[PDB]
Design an enzyme around this catalytic site. Structure first.
Site: not given
Ligand SMILES: Nc1ncc(C(=O)NC2CN(C(=O)C3CC3)C2)c2ccc(-c3cccc(F)c3)nc12
Ligand SMILES: [Mg+2]
Lengths: 286, 294
Positions: B19, B20-22, B37, B136
């Site tokens: 869709v 450190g990538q989710v 993640k 964040d």
């Protein structure tokens, strides 16, 4: 307005576990020859930040100490997403010099190994500087090795996009402060970075590594020039570190002046070090 | 289900698609959609996670927070970096950045900004009363569901596991949503992290919803980082906005955090409190999600 990478190049896996971002270990479909592929989604707000990144890689990669550009491609995406720009370059199988120190007992390299690598970095930097190009990101991660211990410079992503990045290798002038509001950039900024890389090779980590990146970014322009912890190092090596890490960039030596430094110029074990590094790569692989 | 442990995700969660990538995941037992993640962590980084798991503060589920389900480690062979999985609630409509970008003029209606900002504040209020700073807040970290529900990204914000370990940990990320206090200067040598830092970030997100991009976007991140603690509080470019909206921006963007209002004080602000078109805006946002999907 290039061509589709299908049948020419294919992605295998992401290399630096995040360090470089969307950089893949690719493969030249017809020969099987490895290549490194930088994948960047071409959005409307990043149209010219990608176009000139190709122009820099092609023109300035024709040098033995810089990872050679192969070609640029665009993989067309279905209506509902942006296209992907593939930037193909020579693959460096031995990895980065950050990984080399990390995979060495005591996380330290031999002083003559540091002398060989630093000279090759300087030689690569000299080619860019004569061509009016600042690398802006000299760090052990951006300095790569090949299977036969060839040192090659990588990343033109910030060379002269919204993320600041690791601060530990940045020169004081690069970091904007009260007396330096516009952060006056210079070719000599890479030389400070080169000196931090030499401390990185000698200690396994850059100075202020044990600190928060925001605190390190605050201390670099205030703290005196970094020094080597150990006294074991030669007077030539301390002089080189001193030469690279001159706080005020205005009195920092040029790439040519640093190439003439005894630590860089006087290398009697040049051949033997090249074999020693080649042996170290094979030992780690198996 | 446990948050204080570091179990193998096998039989609990499984990855479905990118869709450190989710990545789009799934609960092995129920089939419930999840956002996972995946980060490659070294053996030493796995110990830092074990320490930070003890640093986690406990707090219930919330309507305005994409629920954090926990942390897992899928074991790789001895020598290879293991994979850290951070599981969270799935939000099908995507982020606010995706909502404002796929909108004409890259600007949202003032009442839409009022609805979203209130939901962000409501989510932040739950974290703050539970002694947790989000750290964040931005458009990309504020998500929407199919039902036009606003939910904050949470991959263990209490311990900041998605930012402490990995290669990008030593990196100073995007500076544009950072409060002046989180940026180190001469009379701020140590960056002080207060709960009110999220409120400055919330105010920058409101400018992002109103203009498409945060203030100082057109600048180099290093120059922006230098200007945020020196420049007066950012203002909206256009004069079209209501006196209530300017007051809210002013309220959020108080330079000195010591003199910045609390999440509760900002929830009582007329721009957040007085929302007559609440139901109509909820339907308008639901309509916008469907037409973008087709
Ligand atoms: N040109 C490159 N060759 C090899 C590696 C690399 O990481 N190689 C190591 C991973 N390795 C392997 O997979 C071994 C098995 C061969 C060695 C590599 C890593 C990063 C980059 C880079 C970064 C930013 C921008 C850019 F344009 C290029 N470029 C490269
Ligand atoms: Mg070359």
């Amino acid at each position: 307005s290039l061509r589709d990478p299908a049948g020419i190049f294919e992605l295998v896996e992401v290399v630096g576990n995040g360090t470089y971002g969307q950089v893949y270990k690719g493969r030249h479909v017809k020969t099987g020859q490895l290549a490194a592929i930088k994948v960047m989604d071409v959005t409307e707000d990043e149209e010219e930040e990608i176009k000139l990144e190709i122009n820099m890689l092609k023109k300035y990669s024709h040098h033995r100490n810089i990872a050679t550009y192969y070609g640029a491609f665009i993989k067309k995406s279905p209506p509902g997403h942006d296209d992907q720009l593939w930037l193909v370059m020579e693959f460096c199988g031995a990895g980065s010099i950050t990984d080399l120190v990390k995979n060495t007992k005591g996380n330290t390299l031999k002083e003559d190994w540091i002398a060989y690598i630093s000279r090759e970095i300087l030689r690569g930097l000299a080619h860019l500087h004569i061509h009016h190009v600042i690398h802006r990101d000299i760090k052990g991660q951006n300095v790569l090795l090949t299977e036969n211990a060839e040192v090659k410079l990588v990343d033109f992503g910030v060379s002269a996009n919204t993320f600041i990045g690791t601060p530990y290798w940045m020169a004081p002038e690069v970091i904007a402060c009260d007396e330096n509001p516009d952060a006056t950039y210079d070719y000599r900024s890479d030389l400070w970075s080169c000196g931090i890389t030499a401390i990185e090779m000698a200690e396994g980590a850059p100075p202020l590594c044990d600190m928060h990146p925001m605190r390190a970014l605050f201390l670099i322009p205030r703290n005196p020039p970094p020094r080597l912890k150990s006294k074991k190092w030669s007077k030539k090596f301390f002089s080189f570190i001193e030469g690279c890490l001159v706080k005020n960039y205005m009195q920092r030596p040029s790439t040519e002046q640093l190439l003439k430094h005894p630590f860089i110029r006087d290398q009697p074990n040049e051949r033997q070090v090249r074999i020693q590094l080649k042996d170290h790569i094979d030992r780690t692989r198996k």
